Write an enzyme that holds these catalytic residues in place. Structure first.
Site: not given
Lengths: 143, 143
Positions: A11, A51, A53, A59, A87, A93, A114, A117, A120, A128, A136
Site C-alpha cells: 500500500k 473495492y 463490493e 469507510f 494471510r 487487518t 496498514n 493487502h 481474503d 482480484e 498472459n
C-alpha cells in the site's frame, strides 16, 4: 495441498517508507513465489473498481483515498496454500490486533494505513488477480 | 548529490532463486527509491534490442539465451548519485572481484549468472530506462 495464487498490494504507506523489499522478502522466505508484479498509481476509478463490493459502506471513501494517495505495488504470489499462508504473514487487518513479526505489526501505522493487502479467499483472489492482470501477464517460472 | 535515475534488472537466476525481496531491500537500505517496476519474460527480440550494443560480440548468444531463460524484474531506482551508488551495492560485474556484502558477492553464482544488472552511465541509464519504461510509467512519490 494445491498450488494457489493470491493478490498482494504493498500500500502507499509501505511504498513511501521504502519497505517494498523487506515485504517481498517475507513472501519469498515463506516459500511464496512472485509470478507477477508492477508498480502503479491507482486512479480514483481504479480503486473504486477494485473495492466495488464496499461501494455503500461508510469507510469506502476513506479506503479509496488512502489507496490512491501514492503509488502501490501489485503482485501475484504463487505457492502451496497461498491465500491463507499469505494471510498469516500479513497478520490481522488491524495492526493493533496483528501478532508480532507479521507485516502489519512491523510496517503498519493504523487500520487505514496498514502497509499491505492480501486476498481474503481463493474466490476473491481470482477476481482480484484478474482485475489487475491479464492471464498472459502472469509469468510462469521457467529456469 | 543530484538526484538521478538508473535501471535495475533482477536477472533470471536471482528471480528463480526468489531473491527479489532481498535485492530490493539492499536498494532501499542504500537510500534508493523504487519508482517503477515490473516482472517480464523477455522475448529474444526484447533481449536483443536491449543488449544491441553487444550484438557483434561472441558472448551475445549466451547473454540473450540466459536473459530469456526465465522471468526478470526491471525497475527504475531513484536517488542521489543513483547510477554510481547502485553500482557500489551491486559490486563488481565479476562476483569473484565483488566486495563483501554486495549483491554480486551474495547472490551471483558466476560471471554469466551474476544476479543483477545496473546501468553503467547516465547516458546508458537514460537509454535503458526509456527502453523498458514510458515516462508516464515512472511513478513519482507523492507522500
Amino acid at each position: 495441498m494445491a498450488i494457489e495464487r493470491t493478490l498482494s498490494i504493498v500500500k502507499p504507506d509501505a511504498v513511501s517508507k521504502n519497505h517494498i523489499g523487506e515485504i517481498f522478502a517475507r513472501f519469498e522466505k515463506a516459500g511464496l513465489k512472485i509470478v507477477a508484479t508492477k508498480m502503479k498509481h491507482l486512479s480514483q476509478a481504479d480503486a473504486e473498481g477494485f473495492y466495488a463490493e464496499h461501494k455503500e459502506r461508510g469507510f469506502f471513501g476513506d479506503l479509496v483515498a488512502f489507496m490512491t494517495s501514492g503509488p502501490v505495488v501489485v503482485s501475484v504470489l504463487e505457492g502451496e496454500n497461498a491465500v491463507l499462508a499469505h494471510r498469516e504473514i500479513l497478520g490481522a487487518t488491524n495492526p493493533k490486533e496483528a501478532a508480532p513479526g507479521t507485516i502489519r505489526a512491523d510496517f503498519a501505522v493504523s487500520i487505514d494505513e496498514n502497509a499491505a493487502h492480501g486476498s481474503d479467499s481463493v474466490a476473491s483472489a481470482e477476481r482480484e488477480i484478474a482485475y489487475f492482470f491479464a492471464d498472459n501477464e502472469i509469468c510462469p517460472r521457467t529456469r
